[PDB]
Amino acid sequence: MDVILLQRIKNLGKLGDKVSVKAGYGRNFLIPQGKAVAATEANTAAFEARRAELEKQEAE
RNA sequence: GAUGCAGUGUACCCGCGGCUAGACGGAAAGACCCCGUGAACCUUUACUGCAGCUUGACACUGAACUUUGA
C-alpha cells in the first residue's frame, strides 16, 4: 500500500513523505497507531491543505 | 416303472373296525447341479473414484539486524 507518513519513522522518511510499504505493515501498525495515513486523494488534500503546518511544528 | 392301452385271469351290490405296499400320495414354481452378458454382502499387491492423513506454492503475513550459496 501507499502511505504518507504523519510523523517521523526511522527508515521510511520524515513528516509527509509518501512511501510504499507491505500491506500488513501499514494495515496493522502504522494506520491504527496514527503513524501514517493512506495516500488517497482526499487524505492528501487533508494533509497538505490545512494540517501540514500543524504536523510540522508538532515535531516532538 | 400303467386302475384306464393289448392279451388274459379273477370278480354279485354297499358299509364298519384296522393297515400303509401303490396312487412316481399331500406340503413348499429344488436349497444340490447348470444357465442368465441376474442380485446381494465380504476380501485383495483387480479397475476406477472419494473421505481422511500428508508435501510444497500463493493468501491471511509484519519490523529489525546478520551469516552463507550460484
UniProtKB/Swiss-Prot annotation:
Membrane-crossing residue ranges in chain numbering: none
Domain of life of the source: Bacteria
Family: Belongs to the bacterial ribosomal protein bL9 family.
Physiological role: Binds to the 23S rRNA.
Name of the protein in question: Large ribosomal subunit protein bL9
Designated gene of the protein: rplI
Range of the intact protein held here: 1 to 60 of 148
